[PDB]
Amino acid sequence: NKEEIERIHREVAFNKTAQVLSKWDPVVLKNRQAEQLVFPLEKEEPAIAPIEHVLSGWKARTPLEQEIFNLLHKNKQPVTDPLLTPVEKLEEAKMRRAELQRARALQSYYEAKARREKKIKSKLPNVIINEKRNIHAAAHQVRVLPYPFTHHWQFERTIQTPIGSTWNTQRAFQKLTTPKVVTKPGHIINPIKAEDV
Amino acid sequence: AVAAAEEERRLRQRNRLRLEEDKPAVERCLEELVFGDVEND
């Protein structure tokens, strides 16, 4: 009948979906245990581009650059460096890979050449203790035993370490006061995306 | 591992011995720039 067919479709659908969601368990557990989280999650390219990235962007408009480029492309010579200038991440692609290997082999040769002349150029008994409790001071001590601590000595261990800059070095102090959540003031925070795809 | 640390201490001492006995004049010029000229005795 129609009814029991439908419930089978729900069962097969849920099992496929649950298996999909299981890949997010490693990410969630790591993030909940992380010492510091930076938002937005997406990384940012460093401030200063190292020239070789920049020179790819430029094109030709003046008559000089037109004639230079035309003569280059009609020949086999390339406009820019393959290894130095990165590009956006079939048979022609293999040839460019081969061209990269020859280009990489060349830089080895000149360096292998250079090393030669460099080598060439180089060539209590009486004490009573008041048993009364200090009710004023005890008002400041902790009453309850917080979770997840079972025995009161276990909670005592965590509190011993001082954190002020008076008792600790400056770099030790910074590690002790690392904030849990760090957010850039003006950037939009987006939801997690497949571990940065 | 005690002998390993005991082996290390003499390595420094032998290395330290070799650098004080013979010093080029250029090094003496540099050490005054880096360490200054102070006498405590």
């Binding site: 276990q154 261990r157 030790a172 002790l176 | -």
Partner: protein, 59 residues
């Protein structure tokens, strides 16, 4: 082959000077949730003491 592999060691005695944890007690903990917190506490104490031991050269 480097004759001394490890990083620069620090004297144990100066480190013990900057310690405020009672190692004498043998408290039992059978729960992992308690275990994680206690190991962090030793980690925080151990790291802070070591930096002060190196800082003795500043004197």
């Amino acid at each position: 082959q480097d004759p001394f592999p490890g990083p620069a060691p620090v004297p144990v005695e100066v480190v013990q000077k900057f310690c405020r944890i009672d190692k004498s007690r043998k408290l039992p903990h059978s729960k992992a949730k308690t275990r994680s917190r206690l190991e962090v506490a030793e980690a925080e104490e151990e790291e802070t003491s070591i930096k002060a031991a190196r800082s003795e050269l500043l004197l």
